[PDB]
Scaffold this active site. Structure first.
Site, PDB file in Angstrom:
ATOM      1  CE  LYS A 133      -4.473   1.264   0.556  1.00 55.62           C
ATOM      2  NZ  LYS A 133      -5.806   0.786   0.606  1.00 55.62           N
TER       3      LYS A 133
ATOM      4  CB  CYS B   8       1.862  12.469  -4.679  1.00 52.40           C
ATOM      5  SG  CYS B   8       3.426  13.222  -5.179  1.00 52.40           S
TER       6      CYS B   8
HETATM    7  C1  LIG Z   1      -9.066   1.195  -4.663  1.00 48.66           C
HETATM    8  C2  LIG Z   1      -7.795   1.603  -5.336  1.00 48.66           C
HETATM    9  C3  LIG Z   1      -6.772   2.128  -4.575  1.00 48.66           C
HETATM   10  C4  LIG Z   1      -5.597   2.517  -5.191  1.00 48.66           C
HETATM   11  N1  LIG Z   1      -4.601   3.040  -4.408  1.00 48.66           N
HETATM   12  C5  LIG Z   1      -3.418   3.438  -4.978  1.00 48.66           C
HETATM   13  C6  LIG Z   1      -2.420   3.953  -4.176  1.00 48.66           C
HETATM   14  O1  LIG Z   1      -2.610   4.054  -2.955  1.00 48.66           O
HETATM   15  N2  LIG Z   1      -1.225   4.324  -4.758  1.00 48.66           N
HETATM   16  C7  LIG Z   1      -1.026   4.206  -6.119  1.00 48.66           C
HETATM   17  O2  LIG Z   1       0.056   4.566  -6.594  1.00 48.66           O
HETATM   18  N3  LIG Z   1      -2.025   3.685  -6.924  1.00 48.66           N
HETATM   19  C8  LIG Z   1      -3.218   3.309  -6.340  1.00 48.66           C
HETATM   20  N4  LIG Z   1      -4.225   2.795  -7.113  1.00 48.66           N
HETATM   21  C9  LIG Z   1      -3.925   2.712  -8.556  1.00 48.66           C
HETATM   22  C10 LIG Z   1      -4.245   1.361  -9.114  1.00 48.66           C
HETATM   23  O3  LIG Z   1      -2.987   0.812  -9.398  1.00 48.66           O
HETATM   24  C11 LIG Z   1      -5.023   1.667 -10.376  1.00 48.66           C
HETATM   25  O4  LIG Z   1      -6.254   0.995 -10.520  1.00 48.66           O
HETATM   26  C12 LIG Z   1      -4.153   1.224 -11.504  1.00 48.66           C
HETATM   27  O5  LIG Z   1      -3.048   2.121 -11.598  1.00 48.66           O
HETATM   28  C13 LIG Z   1      -5.091   1.091 -12.698  1.00 48.66           C
HETATM   29  O6  LIG Z   1      -5.289  -0.296 -12.768  1.00 48.66           O
HETATM   30  P1  LIG Z   1      -6.689  -1.038 -12.950  1.00 48.66           P
HETATM   31  O7  LIG Z   1      -7.249  -0.830 -14.324  1.00 48.66           O
HETATM   32  O8  LIG Z   1      -6.478  -2.537 -12.857  1.00 48.66           O
HETATM   33  O9  LIG Z   1      -7.600  -0.512 -11.869  1.00 48.66           O
HETATM   34  C14 LIG Z   1      -5.424   2.386  -6.559  1.00 48.66           C
HETATM   35  C15 LIG Z   1      -6.457   1.853  -7.324  1.00 48.66           C
HETATM   36  C16 LIG Z   1      -7.644   1.461  -6.707  1.00 48.66           C
HETATM   37  C17 LIG Z   1      -8.779   0.891  -7.502  1.00 48.66           C
END
Ligand SMILES: Cc1cc2nc3c(=O)[nH]c(=O)nc-3n(C[C@H](O)[C@H](O)[C@H](O)COP(=O)(O)O)c2cc1C
Ligand SMILES: Cc1cc2nc3c(=O)[nH]c(=O)nc-3n(C[C@H](O)[C@H](O)[C@H](O)COP(=O)(O)O)c2cc1C
Ligand SMILES: Cc1cc2nc3c(=O)[nH]c(=O)nc-3n(C[C@H](O)[C@H](O)[C@H](O)COP(=O)(O)O)c2cc1C
Ligand SMILES: Cc1cc2nc3c(=O)[nH]c(=O)nc-3n(C[C@H](O)[C@H](O)[C@H](O)COP(=O)(O)O)c2cc1C
Lengths: 310, 310, 310, 309
Positions: free
Chosen positions: A44, A130
């Site tokens: 995380k 960020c």
């Molecule tokens: C619920 C959730 C929390 C996320 N939290 C972070 C995070 O804390 N830090 C980060 O760099 N990316 C975070 N992401 C980015 C995820 O990696 C993001 O969905 C990804 O870059 C896109 O992938 P996906 O199409 O499979 O959702 C988060 C995504 C989701 C859905």
């Protein structure tokens, strides 16, 4: 036929893993990733001190994907740092990614300096999607600040470091971002974070509480953008900077397409949130199937080999 | 139950229409829109001189949406200008939108000055996802140039003018864009143009010929982004600047959500390209059904009334 | 010679126990308390979600006592709630204290409401040395907020509830605090939490990492203050509100003096931290010895019978 | 290696002295301080008229410190004022501190106005750690009244003035107190007075007569609190307001730690009460030893240089 892969000088038994923020809040969840068919995990995103994050509900699913505004909830950097440091010692230990960012540039350096001084020697992922100073967009959308941060960071940081990036949508922005990144001994870039500030409506009401319902979009909505970013950087970055592909991955085919665009490693956010760690087994099989059908034996056989037309 | 609407001082029998670039190349296609249940049409984006556009195929459909890189093919501004001027005279004439842009700012002024000098008095849509000088992103992603263009434009242009906008993905960008738009007697903004520079792969090969397979994404991929942009500007723009909502509309529900976010008028691109002008009849019915079920009589009863969570 | 005692409607085999925060992080530690000569235990102060607490070292010993700035590390309220709920079912189960607080008043209510809705029926200790809004001292030093919180709490909370209190140092503050507490069906108050914001120096450097070396003082430093607070409230509170005495207890004599001042139950922090659960056996014997020498048979024979000078 | 120091524009041969209330009831005791290795003395806290104070016993010692409820016994302000005025004239005269307070704000002004009108030009310490009005805590715990008093005082009072302060225990209180003090041309603050309202028991009975046995705590109990107050104000007050450190001092190390926290001068209460004026010789040596071992030559080399981790 093998889905083994590498990032920097690190090996992985598989080329699928969680996306930062998903299924990685706690030691227990991380261990579940580690014991799944995933090739690695990323923690995380940790901040200097622990954070509760945004009011609930801060996440919602859709037929097509997800929307979230978590607010960087995490148990604090020390928690994840200690955990990945401690896993280094154990035998058969997979390599992992420590995701981190400060709420301010100064905090970011404080964190990195901690990691630098620690016993952790594994991969670090600095999250550049960020917060900046007021009147300024997220950091990676601010090339001046992005360059300044990376410059400062590499005056002291010697551990393997990659950056998590938001999507770009303009050729000139890809050129500008790449001209920055290429200056630095980055181990990798990770494309992409969520598509920022989307809006999802259920009936006539937004579906998440924070930020008036605006949140990062992931899942099916995002793949064309994700693949474009991966490929655009693949074609622009010095080969010493590898690419992790993230966004829209829900099948082996999706992972395949990311690797085709240049990704050395593929990450799953939304679909993992929805399906749980069992998804790695499934997607790995689906990917391997495509490789078999194609006569591919390693990622190397097709990574970055996306074809233009005519 | 009525879907009548207004933009500036102009009335429309309906609040659905084509998105610029789709089903509007010729006088014939335009007439087909005009005789459909659509409340208006917008012309193909016209340049000073006619353009063939990019090599084929420059458009592909997907289960989820579309990707294109047309390259602004059009029969030239004079063609569309003469046509919409000439329709003003006729009885039972609907109000229309003349979409235009130059390949350079100077060309853009040349065109607008022509429209200014012409007999056309209807709505004009300046497409700000247009070519910039080298090393610079599309114009609407370059606030300094955007502000300069709009400033110059309004020193001479007196006709009703709105701007077509690419999506933004950052709160600070919404703020900065709005601070610019608010200065000017814009009749409307139209959110959104395609999500720029997406990549679609069929097999191992991109699916369009131009630009290495990179293109504007439209359709289902885009709605969260579209709605966010409509709402984000709705909450920022002076009410004298209305919002046209475009992106991801394929059902009455989708149109409903755009109007909920603030849209006074809704445009359909991808879905219209796929279904033809019959789509207006269908979507109009589906929208009206939602209004009926909800007890809404006019758009005014719900436009901009999107709800946050408790 | 018996050191049995009661708080509200609950009995205890002994009148010594741990102070909140000390030797009560885990089910294992709590069990060790439960199997020691201690008459009860109080859980680590639990927050809604688990917390890592402050950076190390966050605790240091001294010849005279201790200084700490833990930052409320705990495994989360659910962990302690489930554990004490589950011990209720057991036979020969001792009665326990569930310590809790939110990082904000709203969080505090969320926690209490959970406890209210749970199957736990035992004693609860609300820690009123918690974060207030900026520019406001710890809650129990802010009588207006203290009164408001307790007022809200008792509109819904029906379980036996006491409050953990910081020390006061002024007659008028005792009066004001008491006038508030007396309004409510509190089962007990617990005097005292640490003496706040003390500073300990080893050589020329502070001895704890958090908060610039400032921390709560416990142990020998604190007894005069602790006894004063117990007695001062004993003489002010309606007898339906009992007093738990905490601070500076390291011998039976110290416990004796607390009971003399009015305490129905005595808690050990620093000394327990230093000596481990074996301390209960020792201190119980030392207390009983004083009682024997004095001819006391139960706490009732001397509780609150501290004498002024002739 | 020197323990010389300054407060305002005044010099002192040493940086240790008595704490107000201890060993300073009479001209004789004061003289004994003056002839000891102490760098100064502060008078018994004087009120407008002399006071017998509280019933005895009003003071008790402990293995760890002391508890007292004196009730401001003193021979009256005029007694101390005349005495320190008169010492000014002498050659080789050390600078001193005149401690004073009224039983009410009005009395406090009457006293200060007397000092203002007198020939005394030395340091004055206004004791704010004692109460005044009903339904209200001791003055320094009542920021509104504290600000009002200091405001009134400085409309007329031109002599060098510092305030004696009770301990605070909350960051926000330090902030609030400091925001007040910084408004005023205070020469110094003195942290800390006793930890208020502690209770000491011997067998089954309180050990002092007044106030049901409740009293100010001093000595070992108090050092963490004292150092914290000194440091907390050191980090908050404008440098034109110096800090005198009091509380828990029984060794050179304790005085060292106070100076480390920011104190320009260190005062000894309980330990002085227990050991007598000879204590200054001892503690001075113990402090100087630490300075030598550390290579410090003046207080300036380490004052306020306490280190975080
Ligand atoms: C619920 C959730 C929390 C996320 N939290 C972070 C995070 O804390 N830090 C980060 O760099 N990316 C975070 N992401 C980015 C995820 O990696 C993001 O969905 C990804 O870059 C896109 O992938 P996906 O199409 O499979 O959702 C988060 C995504 C989701 C859905
Ligand atoms: C084939 C095609 C051509 C387009 N041409 C233009 C154009 O010339 N000018 C413009 O402003 N938008 C143009 N667009 C953008 C459409 O307006 C775009 O799809 C719309 O802004 C997104 O809506 P949709 O999701 O309903 O397709 C074009 C879109 C497509 C698919
Ligand atoms: C390391 C440590 C952790 C503590 N944690 C808490 C806490 O979480 N909640 C609370 O109310 N008091 C907490 N306290 C206060 C203890 O209850 C404190 O020491 C007691 O109130 C003072 O008693 P003592 O002199 O025996 O140490 C903690 C104290 C220490 C030393
Ligand atoms: C017996 C006794 C009498 C005191 N009388 C006064 C007084 O009259 N005015 C005052 O400001 N402080 C008075 N104090 C406070 C001393 O300055 C106090 O002990 C000092 O502030 C705490 O330091 P210590 O630990 O060295 O005793 C008295 C203290 C004691 C022990």
């Amino acid at each position: 036929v093998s889905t083994h892969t590498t990032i920097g000088s690190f090996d992985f038994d598989n080329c699928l893993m969680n996306a930062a923020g998903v299924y990685c809040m706690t030691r227990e969840e991380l261990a579940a990733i580690d014991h799944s068919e995933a090739g690695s995990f990323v923690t995380k995103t940790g901040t200097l001190e622990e954070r509760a994050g945004n009011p609930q509900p801060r996440y919602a699913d859709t037929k097509l994907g997800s929307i979230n505004s978590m607010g960087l909830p995490n148990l604090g950097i020390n928690y994840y740092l200690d955990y990945v440091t401690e896993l280094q010692k154990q035998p058969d230990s997979k390599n992992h990614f420590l995701s981190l960012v400060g709420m301010s540039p100064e905090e970011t350096h404080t964190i990195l300096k901690m990691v630098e001084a620690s016993k952790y020697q594994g991969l670090v992922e600095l999250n550049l999607s960020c917060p900046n100073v007021p009147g300024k967009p997220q950091i990676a959308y601010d090339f001046e600040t992005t360059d300044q941060i990376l410059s400062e960071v590499f005056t002291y940081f010697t551990k393997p470091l990659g950056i998590k990036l938001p999507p770009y949508f303009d050729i000139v922005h890809f050129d500008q971002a790449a001209a920055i990144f290429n200056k630095y001994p980055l181990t990798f870039v990770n494309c992409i974070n969520s598509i920022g500030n989307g809006l999802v409506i259920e009936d006539e009401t937004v579906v998440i509480k924070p930020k008036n319902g605006f949140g990062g979009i992931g899942g099916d909505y995002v793949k064309p953008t994700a693949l474009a970013n991966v490929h655009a950087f693949y074609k622009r970055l010095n080969p010493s900077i590898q690419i992790i592909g993230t966004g829209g991955v829900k099948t082996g085919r999706d992972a395949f397409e990311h690797i085709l665009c240049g990704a050395s490693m593929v990450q799953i956010g939304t679909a993992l949130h929805q399906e749980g760690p069992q998804i790695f087994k499934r997607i790995t099989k689906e990917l391997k199937a495509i490789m078999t059908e194609k006569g591919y034996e390693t990622l190397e056989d097709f990574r970055g080999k996306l074809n233009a037309m005519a």
